[PDB]
Every structure is written in structure tokens, then in C-alpha cells.
Design a protein around this nucleic acid. Sequence first.
DNA 1: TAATAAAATAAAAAAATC
DNA 2: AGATTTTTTTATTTTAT
DNA 3: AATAAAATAAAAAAATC
DNA 4: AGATTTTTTTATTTTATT
DNA 5: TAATAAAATAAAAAAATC
DNA 6: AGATTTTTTTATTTTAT
DNA 7: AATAAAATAAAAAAATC
DNA 8: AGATTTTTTTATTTTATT
Lengths: 178, 178, 178, 178
Amino acid sequence: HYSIKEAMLFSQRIAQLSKALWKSIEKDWQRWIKPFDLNINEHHILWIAYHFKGASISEIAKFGVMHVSTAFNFSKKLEEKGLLSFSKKQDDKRNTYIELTEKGEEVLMKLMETYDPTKNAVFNGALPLRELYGKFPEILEMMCIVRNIYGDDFMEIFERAFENIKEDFIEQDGKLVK
Amino acid sequence: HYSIKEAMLFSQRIAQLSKALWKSIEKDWQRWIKPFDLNINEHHILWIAYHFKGASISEIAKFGVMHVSTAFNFSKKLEEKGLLSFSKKQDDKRNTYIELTEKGEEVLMKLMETYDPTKNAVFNGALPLRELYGKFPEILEMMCIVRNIYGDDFMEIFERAFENIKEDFIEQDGKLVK
Amino acid sequence: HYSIKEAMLFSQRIAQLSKALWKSIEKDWQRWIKPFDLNINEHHILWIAYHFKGASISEIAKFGVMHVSTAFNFSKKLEEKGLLSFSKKQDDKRNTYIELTEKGEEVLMKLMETYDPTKNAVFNGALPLRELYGKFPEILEMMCIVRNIYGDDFMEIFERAFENIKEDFIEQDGKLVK
Amino acid sequence: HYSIKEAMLFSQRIAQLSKALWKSIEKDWQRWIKPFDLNINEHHILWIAYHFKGASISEIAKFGVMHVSTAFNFSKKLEEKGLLSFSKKQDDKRNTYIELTEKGEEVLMKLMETYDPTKNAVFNGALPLRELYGKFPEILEMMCIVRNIYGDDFMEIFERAFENIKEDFIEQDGKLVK
DNA sequence: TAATAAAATAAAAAAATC
DNA sequence: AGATTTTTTTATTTTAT
DNA sequence: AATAAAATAAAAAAATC
DNA sequence: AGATTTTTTTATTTTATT
DNA sequence: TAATAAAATAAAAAAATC
DNA sequence: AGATTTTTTTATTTTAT
DNA sequence: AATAAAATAAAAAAATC
DNA sequence: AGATTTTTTTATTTTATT
Ligand SMILES: [Mg+2]
Ligand SMILES: [Mg+2]
């Protein structure tokens, strides 16, 4: 059992913090992918499909943090730009599934190449901690909180992106490459 | 140095973790302020003027993570709803200072009465951690990152809210009241 | 559940750490008190009495992490040196109580004067962390572990020492004094 | 910078934690090894020499947090009990290098099979934390502090012990075996 | 709709001019 | 750029004999 | 039992704002 | 330099969209 | 005891010496 | 410098009519 | 049950390694 | 400078104490 004050204190503090973060993250994310004329959720969708091939609209709307409507509309615009593949399987024909086309994987890799960590603000904001820790910050308390909110299945996005990028990419001339 | 691989690993973990965390906080925040016909940034501006009286447009755009222009446009709607008061100053009339009207302060205080932490998802997410530790999670690594991004003066908002809630408010019948 | 390998991995990591930590704290503690011809458990006994006046030999042994016989022998050795006043009282007389004499209080505070944090190596080892955090490390994970082993009653010594030192003392010429 | 009050608020908190933690580790470690009539520092020496074959007396004293006189005398007693081999090198003859004999390896790995986590207090104190996290506590803050006090070369023992337990041992019938 | 760049604008400060 | 509603569609599911 | 009819509920998909 | 003029800088303020 | 001061002692390197 | 053992000592608990 | 006992337990107080 | 001698430095190695 808890004081109401002590809740307001915790609720307001993590509000400000999570808004400060993500806005900083959103800015650096949209700056990096505007050259390729992708918006944030769009790019997130393509990454959802690369790690989770064949996902359903509601499934990608799960792993990217977006409404089901946003996923359908932004994923069909990725279809017309030729970056996404829609599909249906008629055991249950209410369900529309998406796959990444070759063009889309390509722009993912090219965006991966244009990545410059130094122009990302939380990267630079986290480097102090890394220096004395020996590793980048884990932010485990946040991962615990997120898990209890979204469920362990959601958290599959993390380790699918961890293992895949550790094995599906390498560094040559200071850029990430396949 | 660091690997550009090791960098991406950290950047995708924090990116998704914070989009998760903000969106969760976003919807719970929208839900409690719609009864009084506010949006997040409007409510955010009102709390900033409560804690930082007579602050510049650019200042409340600093403390609330918003653009100067969104600060000025939502700050004017708040005075057309009567909740804010605009002033200018002797030394430099380019600045425009903002104060809370007592209609504005009232709706803040009434919303504080409606606050049910049980309906906030991040709060329920942090309860298991609160039990083990005995106090709420501090997410200290994130406070450090945000600080090295926004700088020490942005971080006065956390301290001013902490002190003000603690010394301006008090519990009665499970609600926070003056 | 846990694998035996995973558990051994944790049990050696903390055994080596707690040994390392305790031994450096042991040396600096001895340096500090050898001038006054005290030993660790004697100095801890006197500090237990200062925070917990009228405490039993068994009770002193709880907070001082020492065997009850160890407390007994070292405690009456302190009475010969005239810093401790034994008592026996009221209903039950198998219990032997302790309080701190005038001579004992002064040697505490005088040792508190000779305190130089820079000669203590664990202080120095935490200074890099304190810069980045703002405050000293909270070492919460071992605080949780130490509680689960010893119980919430035991952890009252932390809480009693925190409050007493905070306002039974003040700083003068780089010295703690009453 | 820091206060002298703030400095000793930290010094006492880690003194008391360190002592509490080392003494529940002390007595759990003793109980485990008395069956094979070893003491803690003798058992440490056997694990130092297993992980670091050919270690010097001084080096053994580094990794096992003990005086060079104790590591010598307890290394001797291990030679008289037939578990450690004493060597010299003709290039520099003031050095004296230690190496486990096969009788020495066998007693270590029978004790490895004797290991029951559930009799260890610190393990059980840590199980609630492993529940929330998914992994055991890392107490990074204590690793940071200990690395600054002892230096990065000492800290090699954690990394070698980690990887050696990982690869040299396997789980058969709920016990760690080679 | 809740935000936001990209202009636009007015005022203060800073820099040029002699 | 990214929501909320509402529609509209399919398939389970639940009834009703 | 079987069915067949009738809500109820999954999953999109299509206008708002 | 001291009195003026010019350019830049700062802070909005409004406008064009997502 | 399970430890560790404190000398004590052999070697080796380092400084000195001319 | 610290314990693990012994002992010893009250008070409490349990067992007996 | 009311007592008195045998037994148990608590808390020191000793002697070892 | 090169060969020598002499000091310090290092690593045990043995003592005695809480
Ligand atoms: Mg933590
Ligand atoms: Mg605690």
C-alpha cells in the first residue's frame, strides 16, 4: 500500500522523463530517415517485418507501438511506394499479413549504413555512463516496467533485433553492413 | 572506442523502450485530462506555470518538451479559456511572460483530486519493483541521460515539482488536496 | 527456475566481491581506530550503544554482525576501559543491558573528528560514480539482499544512524562535531 | 565536491553492508569446505591456481584478497596435504610459482558437486531480485568500486572464473560436474 | 486533432562608420 | 504524422428446435 | 443428437479531426 | 573616442501543414 | 584457529664509482 | 581478533497428580 | 481446575581452538 | 665509457601475535 502523494511523485517524474526521452529520440530518428522520405512508424513497420516476417496488421501494431489503424494506413502507403508486401491466408481471411519486399530491405540496409551514432543525442548522453560501467546502460528498471505493461511476447522484439543485428550485420569502414 | 554495432544495439533498445514508455504514459494522461477539455501540452503548460511562475514562452517550451510555437499557440488558448494571464516587462518587451489564473489553478487542483494511480499503467508496472525495493523505482540511468541532453536547468522542473507536491498538497479520503 | 551453473556463477561473483569490499573497509577502519586502541567490533559495539541505548548483548550482536559471545567478551573489556556501563533490570534478569558512558561518547565523537574520507579507499572508489549520479551510490541491490537475510529489524541501524548523524552533527573546519 | 556529513553517511552504510554481506558469505563458505577439511583462504588458493595456473605467491595474494604471508603459509599447508605443486624459474629465482596437483583438482570438483545453492543465504536473499529481473543481480556499483580499489588486473579473476565455470563444467543430475 | 517547421515580425544588441 | 470512430467483413459462438 | 438460426467478437478497413 | 547608422541577434508571432 | 603483522633473508636490479 | 564450542543461569513451558 | 514437577527454553556467561 | 663495486629494490621466507 502506498501514499497518494508518493504515487503522484512517481507518476509525474516518469512522465517528464519519458517525454524528454523519445522526443529527443523522435527528432533524431526523423532527421535520419527523412532523406529516404520515410516517417517514423513507417520505418518501424519495415523493421517489424524484417525481424518478424509475415506479421499481421495487429501484430505489427503490437511490436511497433502504434494503433491498428495507423499500421494499416501507413503499411498500404509502403505498399504503393513498393516497399511492402501484403498477403492473405484464407483459413482466416479477416487477417492481412505483410512481408518486406527486396526494395524495402534495401532501404533498411542503406539507412543502416547512413547511421552515425554521434548525431544521436541519447547515445552521447549515455556515453558517460558507459565509460565507468564498461558497457552501455541497461536501463533495466525501465525494461521491467515495460514488460509488465506489454507482456513478455511484446519483448520478443528486443532479442530478435539483438541477435539478428549481431549476426546479420558487420562493420566495414566505420559503417554497419551485411 | 565502441562498435557501430554495439552502438546500434543500444540505440534500438532505448528507442523502442521509450516509445513504449511514452505511448503508455500518453494515453493514460490524455484520459484523465479530457474530462476538463485539455490536451497533454495544455495541461503540461499549466503545471509549468504553477511551478515556474512568470516564465517566458521559450522557458515553458523548455520545461515541457515542446516547440516555442506550440507553447505560444496552446498558451493563448489557455488564456481564451481564462486559465492563463500574459504579461510583458520593462527591460525587454520581446519576452512574453505567463501566469496562472485562479480558474487555471483550480482545474489543476481538481484534476489532482481525480488522479487514480490504479488506472495509470506505468504505475501498476512499477508496483512489483516498489515492493522489492521499498521505494518507487528511480530509473537513475535515465535521469542521467536526460540531464546530459537537456542540461541542468531543465532538470529544475523535477526538483520544483517534488518539493511543491510534498509541501503544497496533502491526502484526505484517498485524494490529493491543498 | 535457476540452473546450478547460473547459481554458481552468481555465488562466486558475490563471494569475491564481498571479500574484496570487506577487506579494504577492514583495513581503513583499523587504521582509524588503532590510535585510540579500539578494534573494529569494539568500535562497532560503542556505535551500537550510541544509536541503540539500553541494548542487550544478543541485540548488540545482531546489529554488529558478531557472535553473542564475541559481544560479551569485547563488551566487558570495554567496561574495564570504562566506556560501557552494564545493566541488569526489571522482570527478566538473564538479560544484560548496555549503555554508553560519558567517556565512551567523547571517544566516539573524537574519532569522528579524525575522520578523513580521503584515506578510506571505498569512499574514493565511489567518487567517480557520485560525480555522474549527483549523489553517492545507493547500492540498493545489496541493501535488498542484506535485508532478506537479516530482516527488517536489523536494517533499523542504517535508519537510526542516518538520522542521528544527519542532525546530531555538523561540519566545522572540515571536521564533523556535535 | 562533497560534504563530510555526506561522506560519512556513505562510509557507514557500506561498512555495515560489507560486514553483513561478508559474514553470511563467510559462514556459508566455511560449512561447505569443512567436510574436506579446508579453510576459506586455502580453498580460494585452489581456485586461484586452477584459474591462473603458474601464479606467483604475490599474484595469488592479489586475486585472493590476502596477505602474501598468509598465501605462502596456507600454500605450504596445501603442499603438505598434497594438493599444490611449488615451482621456481631459473631466470628469476626469488619467485615461487604454484600449480594444482591432480589430487588438488579432484577435491575442488568434488566440492563443486557438493554445492547446494539453497543452503547459501546470499543466493536466497537474491532470488526475489532474480524473479523481477529475469537474471541475477549484477550489483554494478560494487563492481565499479572494487575495480577502482584493486585495479583492472585483479578484476580478471571474475572474467576467468565466469568463463571457466561456463565451459569446463556441465549439469548432470542437478549437480555441477566436469 | 495535438503538434510543428518556416516563415514573418518587432525590439534590442551588436557592429560598423566617421 | 498518428490518432479515434465507424464501417464492414469473416468466423465463432450461442442459442433455438 | 443433430442441426440451423441468431447474436457476439475477431480483424480489418474505411472517414474524421 | 563619441555620436550616429547598420547589421545581426533575439524572441516572439503568425502561417503552412502532419 | 584463520589470519597477519613484523622482521628476516636470498636474488636481482639499480645506482654508484673510476 | 575472532569464533565454536563448552558450560552455567533464569524464566517458561510442559507435564504430572 | 489447581498445584508441583520434570522438561524445556531463553540468555547470557565461560572455556576452547 | 666499460668494468667494477655498492646500494636499493623485489620476492619470498620465517617469525610473533589478536
Ligand atoms: Mg537498478
Ligand atoms: Mg532497503
